[PDB]
């Protein structure tokens, strides 16, 4: 449209306002690309927050998955004690 | 909105919406400080539940 | 008394769950007004894509002062149309508030 920007504005070469007609659409389209990127600002800052939710969630899992480690480390240790009484009977009823 | 042609309207919508921008920002001041305080209760009670168990 | 109050939990768990959708219906209607930005609005205040046409159809009116009123006409329109769209957003938010 830039040839058309000088096709429709041929008698306006004496007019200073031909450059305003030139300056019109560039002043539009500079703003339209701002707002498209300004959507992209609020779109990213949601995702920037939304990624941080998962960052807590992965942290909160493995901290809690460290807890079931200690429970299973305890419970397996306790079932080891529970097997002692089973073999204490096989020891004693033979020794009786 | 105002000063594109409406210098008079700059005080109009700024009087209308600039209050409500300021009021919603004061709600944004208040609630973030509450969530920061409510998160602090969760942090201590999570440390509490570990402490009891 | 235990059965008295769990029978009062059930309205309050439903009434909360009723207002969850009625909150979000306002949010969906706020997203329409959200959809244009700060400078999309400023893009509208320039009469570009008609501003050359604002001086194409008004070439002999350069002696006329009223050419600027023709310029001043649509900007005085569109400043009001964005007010009322946001004024809908006022009553829309205060319901949700």
Author numbering:
A (entry chain W): 207 to 302
B (entry chain F): 266 to 318
C (entry chain L): 158 to 254
What's the publication's text?
α-Xenorhabdolysin is a PFT that has been first isolated from the bacterium Xenorhabdus nematophila. They are composed of two subunits, namely XaxA (45 kDa) and XaxB (40 kDa) and are only active when the two components act together. Xenorhabdolysins, which were suggested to be binary toxins, perforate the membranes of erythrocytes, insect granulocytes and phagocytes and induce apoptosis. In contrast to previous predictions, XaxAB is therefore not a typical binary toxin, but rather a bi-component α-PFT.
Most of the complexes contain either 12, 13, 14 or 15 subunits. We used the highest resolved cryo-EM density of the tridecameric pore complex to build an atomic model of XaxAB. Each subunit consists of a XaxAB heterodimer with XaxA bound to the back of XaxB. This results in a localization of XaxA on the periphery of the pore, whereas XaxB resides more at the center of the complex lining the inner pore lumen. Depending on the number of subunits, the inner diameter of the pore narrows down from 140 to 170 Å at the membrane-distal part to 40–55 Å at the transmembrane region. The inner surface of the pore is hydrophilic and mostly negatively charged suggesting a preference for positively charged ions and molecules. At the outside, the pore complex has a conserved highly hydrophobic band of 40 Å corresponding to the transmembrane region. The hydrophobic band merges into a positively charged stretch that is formed by the conserved arginine and lysine residues of XaxA (R290, K291, K293, K295, K301). Besides the described twist of XaxA, the α-helical tongue αF of XaxB folds out forming the transmembrane region.
